[PDB]
From Swiss-Prot:
One of its GO terms (cellular component) is cytoplasm. Heparin binds at residue 9. The gene is FGF1. Changing residue 86 to A: No effect on integrin-binding. No effect on integrin- and heparin-binding, loss of FGFR1-binding, defective in inducing FGF1 signaling, cell proliferation and cell migration. It comes from Homo sapiens (Human). This is Fibroblast growth factor 1. The chain holds residues 25 to 153 of 155 of the full protein. It comes from the Eukaryota. Keywords: Acetylation, Angiogenesis, Cytoplasm, Developmental protein, Differentiation, Growth factor, Heparin-binding, Mitogen, Nucleus, Phosphoprotein, Secreted.
Amino acid sequence: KPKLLYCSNGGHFLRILPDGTVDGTRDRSDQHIQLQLSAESVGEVYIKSTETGQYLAMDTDGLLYGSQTPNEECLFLERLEENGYNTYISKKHAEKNWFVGLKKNGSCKRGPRTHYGQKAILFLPLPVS
């Protein structure tokens, strides 16, 4: 049911740390990379941490974070791209085209700094098992 969100940019797996922070990691054994995606409406998804129960979210600053409670900031519009990768846009900031993204160093690429045509936004869901 859960998957790993592999960031093509730097090859990191999306990670939601116990401290509420979100970043990228190359460590396949990391306990914080197993995410369960759940669709609310069609094309709409929640990305929860199986380890902590936290929901992936995007703040008004465009920074990703681990949310203890699902919420409006927790919704993402998933998009299956032509090149084979998926994309996730902040539903709450769609109009601005704010994506989920990771820098080559595995750090979060703020929503505002994101842009289509970027690698940082390309993700690949992979089986955990």
